[PDB]
Write an enzyme that holds these catalytic residues in place. Structure first.
Site, PDB file in Angstrom:
ATOM      1  N   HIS A 134       0.837  -1.194   0.000  1.00  0.00           N
ATOM      2  CA  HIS A 134       0.000   0.000   0.000  1.00  0.00           C
ATOM      3  C   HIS A 134       0.871   1.243   0.000  1.00  0.00           C
ATOM      4  CE1 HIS A 134      -4.046  -1.833   1.476  1.00  0.00           C
ATOM      5  NE2 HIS A 134      -3.422  -2.628   0.631  1.00  0.00           N
TER       6      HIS A 134
ATOM      7  N   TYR B 133      -9.556   5.109   7.816  1.00  0.00           N
ATOM      8  CA  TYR B 133      -9.703   5.365   9.246  1.00  0.00           C
ATOM      9  C   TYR B 133     -10.758   6.462   9.316  1.00  0.00           C
ATOM     10  CZ  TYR B 133      -5.235   3.039  10.320  1.00  0.00           C
ATOM     11  OH  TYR B 133      -4.208   2.142  10.489  1.00  0.00           O
TER      12      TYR B 133
ATOM     13  N   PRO C   1      -4.048  -0.507  18.912  1.00  0.00           N
ATOM     14  CA  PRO C   1      -4.024  -0.909  17.497  1.00  0.00           C
ATOM     15  C   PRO C   1      -4.057   0.215  16.453  1.00  0.00           C
ATOM     16  CG  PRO C   1      -5.489  -2.304  18.724  1.00  0.00           C
ATOM     17  CD  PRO C   1      -5.214  -1.100  19.590  1.00  0.00           C
TER      18      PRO C   1
ATOM     19  N   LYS D 249       1.356  -0.599  15.148  1.00  0.00           N
ATOM     20  CA  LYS D 249       2.734  -0.696  15.640  1.00  0.00           C
ATOM     21  C   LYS D 249       3.145  -1.940  16.442  1.00  0.00           C
ATOM     22  CE  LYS D 249       4.208   2.648  13.545  1.00  0.00           C
ATOM     23  NZ  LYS D 249       4.035   2.255  12.113  1.00  0.00           N
TER      24      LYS D 249
ATOM     25  N   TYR E  89       3.993   6.441  10.253  1.00  0.00           N
ATOM     26  CA  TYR E  89       3.173   5.321   9.821  1.00  0.00           C
ATOM     27  C   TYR E  89       3.958   4.212   9.110  1.00  0.00           C
ATOM     28  CZ  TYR E  89      -1.081   2.824   8.680  1.00  0.00           C
ATOM     29  OH  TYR E  89      -2.058   1.868   8.629  1.00  0.00           O
TER      30      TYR E  89
HETATM   31  C1  LIG Z   1      -7.138  -5.883  17.144  1.00  0.00           C
HETATM   32  C2  LIG Z   1      -5.603  -5.797  16.951  1.00  0.00           C
HETATM   33  C3  LIG Z   1      -5.068  -5.308  15.821  1.00  0.00           C
HETATM   34  C4  LIG Z   1      -3.677  -5.237  15.638  1.00  0.00           C
HETATM   35  N1  LIG Z   1      -3.199  -4.763  14.511  1.00  0.00           N
HETATM   36  C5  LIG Z   1      -1.913  -4.662  14.333  1.00  0.00           C
HETATM   37  C6  LIG Z   1      -1.384  -4.303  12.970  1.00  0.00           C
HETATM   38  O1  LIG Z   1      -2.117  -4.092  12.005  1.00  0.00           O
HETATM   39  N2  LIG Z   1      -0.001  -4.141  12.925  1.00  0.00           N
HETATM   40  C7  LIG Z   1       0.815  -4.336  14.038  1.00  0.00           C
HETATM   41  O2  LIG Z   1       2.011  -4.166  13.994  1.00  0.00           O
HETATM   42  N3  LIG Z   1       0.274  -4.739  15.269  1.00  0.00           N
HETATM   43  C8  LIG Z   1      -1.013  -4.937  15.415  1.00  0.00           C
HETATM   44  N4  LIG Z   1      -1.480  -5.557  16.506  1.00  0.00           N
HETATM   45  C9  LIG Z   1      -0.567  -6.119  17.598  1.00  0.00           C
HETATM   46  C10 LIG Z   1       0.041  -7.481  17.417  1.00  0.00           C
HETATM   47  O3  LIG Z   1      -1.034  -8.393  17.051  1.00  0.00           O
HETATM   48  C11 LIG Z   1       0.847  -7.867  18.621  1.00  0.00           C
HETATM   49  O4  LIG Z   1       1.775  -6.819  18.945  1.00  0.00           O
HETATM   50  C12 LIG Z   1       1.658  -9.171  18.376  1.00  0.00           C
HETATM   51  O5  LIG Z   1       0.744 -10.284  18.526  1.00  0.00           O
HETATM   52  C13 LIG Z   1       2.787  -9.454  19.371  1.00  0.00           C
HETATM   53  O6  LIG Z   1       3.358 -10.755  19.130  1.00  0.00           O
HETATM   54  P1  LIG Z   1       4.072 -11.494  20.321  1.00  0.00           P
HETATM   55  O7  LIG Z   1       4.677 -12.701  19.792  1.00  0.00           O
HETATM   56  O8  LIG Z   1       4.872 -10.560  21.142  1.00  0.00           O
HETATM   57  O9  LIG Z   1       2.880 -11.943  21.245  1.00  0.00           O
HETATM   58  P2  LIG Z   1       1.577 -12.870  21.086  1.00  0.00           P
HETATM   59  O10 LIG Z   1       0.869 -12.880  19.780  1.00  0.00           O
HETATM   60  O11 LIG Z   1       0.776 -12.525  22.320  1.00  0.00           O
HETATM   61  O12 LIG Z   1       2.139 -14.383  21.352  1.00  0.00           O
HETATM   62  C14 LIG Z   1       2.793 -14.735  22.576  1.00  0.00           C
HETATM   63  C15 LIG Z   1       2.781 -16.289  22.707  1.00  0.00           C
HETATM   64  O13 LIG Z   1       3.149 -16.620  24.026  1.00  0.00           O
HETATM   65  C16 LIG Z   1       2.361 -17.671  24.547  1.00  0.00           C
HETATM   66  N5  LIG Z   1       2.358 -17.699  25.998  1.00  0.00           N
HETATM   67  C17 LIG Z   1       1.683 -16.888  26.899  1.00  0.00           C
HETATM   68  N6  LIG Z   1       2.008 -17.152  28.132  1.00  0.00           N
HETATM   69  C18 LIG Z   1       2.809 -18.308  28.069  1.00  0.00           C
HETATM   70  C19 LIG Z   1       3.479 -19.065  29.041  1.00  0.00           C
HETATM   71  N7  LIG Z   1       3.426 -18.796  30.357  1.00  0.00           N
HETATM   72  N8  LIG Z   1       4.197 -20.121  28.606  1.00  0.00           N
HETATM   73  C20 LIG Z   1       4.277 -20.364  27.321  1.00  0.00           C
HETATM   74  N9  LIG Z   1       3.704 -19.725  26.312  1.00  0.00           N
HETATM   75  C21 LIG Z   1       2.996 -18.671  26.766  1.00  0.00           C
HETATM   76  C22 LIG Z   1       1.026 -17.303  24.056  1.00  0.00           C
HETATM   77  O14 LIG Z   1       0.142 -18.428  24.019  1.00  0.00           O
HETATM   78  C23 LIG Z   1       1.349 -16.793  22.649  1.00  0.00           C
HETATM   79  O15 LIG Z   1       1.208 -17.867  21.728  1.00  0.00           O
HETATM   80  C24 LIG Z   1      -2.817  -5.685  16.659  1.00  0.00           C
HETATM   81  C25 LIG Z   1      -3.392  -6.223  17.814  1.00  0.00           C
HETATM   82  C26 LIG Z   1      -4.718  -6.317  17.962  1.00  0.00           C
HETATM   83  C27 LIG Z   1      -5.296  -6.914  19.275  1.00  0.00           C
END
Ligand SMILES: Cc1cc2nc3c(=O)[nH]c(=O)nc-3n(C[C@H](O)[C@H](O)[C@H](O)COP(=O)(O)OP(=O)(O)OC[C@H]3O[C@@H](n4cnc5c(N)ncnc54)[C@H](O)[C@@H]3O)c2cc1C
Length: 391
Positions: free
Chosen positions: A72, A201, A293, A297, A385
């Site tokens: 995009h 948006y 969200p 980021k 952005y």
């Molecule tokens: C509605 C929404 C829209 C979003 N849109 C965007 C977007 O367009 N662009 C963007 O950059 N960000 C966006 N985000 C954010 C993004 O989805 C998160 O920042 C991202 O999921 C982070 O990844 P992570 O691996 O740190 O954590 P997570 O996806 O939370 O994964 C962490 C893993 O750890 C596991 N875990 C938890 N506790 C334990 C434990 N004690 N032992 C073992 N495993 C465990 C969990 O099960 C999980 O599988 C959005 C979020 C939401 C909610």
């Protein structure tokens, strides 16, 4: 068992770090509390920064993304009568964003890892971290009813907001900064053609709305809702009617609606912890910070933390420069605060806040009129952005 780097969490943060490390020859083990399909059931992110796109390429997992992702060059903001497009590519100096779902990124990484033969333990229950400040930390967990011990040199907490990692650091050692917003986002995923080729948006008197997508035949829509709402109170009908009510008439009339594949409410929050490490434990992704969200980021900040951790671990391992790992937090925090500020700003100008007086309403409107009408203003939005440079 024994490994070099133990990774807690098989979300995109942990899988990406694990892939980068495996490729560099640093053995790692990933521990995940849930099952593979549970992880794959999370519909979250849709927008990726170029930096994250290049990291996926560096990790060697970009075939499908390159083929299926959508690049995009602009994004739109609709407010009080008008719709204004921000040309990201020219205002940021050539950069763009890529729309590719988080479920997709996760699936691709999971496949990459399964094929590499690197270790991944799903359903690892009761994970506990030990001797974070010693020379030989270890992780204990339960697979079935047996408690296994995993020895390692370093631990990367990639377990999200509710993970065990951040809880494992002495509370007195961490300083938390948090802001909870008085509203959430009700999202709906449908197998329908998106209403626009670019995201929209919308700031509307009834509340915020967002038109996004996953592909040419799959859309993702959101509407701001009070934290007291229940998703069961929102039928597909009610969702579409509400969405249409918050959009420009010309946009709303082009909307192809349809049955939802997924519906959920995500509450908005800002959260940062300082520092992001303790002894041989380093936090990454949602385990260290949350951004609303609005600015897209979250996953992108996780990518930069991981990129930094991976590179500091490489120097420590291959170059024997273990001292550099101490600067992990300072490096990451610089980028984190900048993105938190942008996400906060985006959130404040696009949402309708409860109990807002006349003055603050006028200023919110003027913020939009100014930033969307000034060349300098548009550039601050665009450069933030597409994503600020990695340090
Ligand atoms: C509605 C929404 C829209 C979003 N849109 C965007 C977007 O367009 N662009 C963007 O950059 N960000 C966006 N985000 C954010 C993004 O989805 C998160 O920042 C991202 O999921 C982070 O990844 P992570 O691996 O740190 O954590 P997570 O996806 O939370 O994964 C962490 C893993 O750890 C596991 N875990 C938890 N506790 C334990 C434990 N004690 N032992 C073992 N495993 C465990 C969990 O099960 C999980 O599988 C959005 C979020 C939401 C909610």
């Amino acid at each position: 068992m024994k490994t070099q780097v133990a990774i807690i969490g098989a979300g995109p943060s942990g899988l990406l770090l694990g892939q980068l490390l495996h490729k560099a020859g640093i053995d790692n083990v990933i521990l995940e509390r849930q099952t593979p399909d549970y992880v794959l059931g999370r519909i979250k992110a849709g927008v990726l920064e170029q930096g994250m796109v290049d990291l996926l390429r560096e990790a060697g997992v970009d075939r499908r993304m390159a083929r299926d992702g959508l690049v995009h060059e602009g994004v739109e903001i609709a407010f009080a009568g008008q719709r204004r497009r921000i040309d990201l590519k020219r205002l940021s100096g050539g950069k763009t964003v890529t729309v590719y779902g988080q479920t997709e990124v996760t699936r691709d990484l999971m496949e990459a890892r399964e094929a590499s033969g690197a270790t991944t333990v799903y359903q690892a229950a009761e994970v506990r971290l030990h001797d974070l400040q010693g020379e030989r930390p270890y992780v204990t967990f339960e697979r079935d009813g047996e408690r296994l011990r995993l020895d390692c040199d370093y631990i990367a907490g990639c377990d999200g907001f509710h993970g065990i990692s951040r809880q494992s650091i002495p509370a007195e050692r961490l300083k938390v900064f948090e802001r909870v917003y008085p509203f959430g986002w009700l999202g709906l995923l449908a197998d329908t053609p998106p209403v626009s080729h670019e995201l929209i948006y919308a700031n509307h008197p009834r509340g915020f709305a967002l038109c996004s997508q996953r592909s040419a035949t799959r859309s993702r829509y959101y509407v701001q809702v009070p934290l007291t709402e229940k998703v069961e109170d929102w039928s597909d009908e009610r969702f579409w009617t509400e969405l249409k009510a918050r959009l420009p008439a010309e946009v709303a009339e082009k909307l192809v609606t349809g049955p939802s594949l997924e519906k959920s409410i995500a509450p908005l929050r800002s959260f940062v912890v300082e520092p992001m490490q303790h002894g041989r434990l380093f936090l990454a992704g949602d385990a260290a910070h949350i951004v609303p969200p609005t600015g897209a980021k979250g996953l992108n900040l996780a990518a930069s933390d991981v990129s930094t951790l991976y590179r500091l671990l490489l120097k420590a391992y291959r170059e024997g420069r273990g001292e550099l790992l101490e600067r992990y937090s300072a490096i990451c925090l610089r980028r984190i605060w900048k993105a938190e500020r942008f996400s906060w700003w985006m959130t404040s100008v696009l949402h309708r806040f409860p109990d807002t007086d006349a003055f603050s309403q006028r200023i919110q409107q003027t913020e939009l009129e100014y930033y969307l009408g000034s060349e300098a203003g548009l550039a601050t939005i665009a450069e933030n952005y597409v994503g600020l440079p990695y340090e």
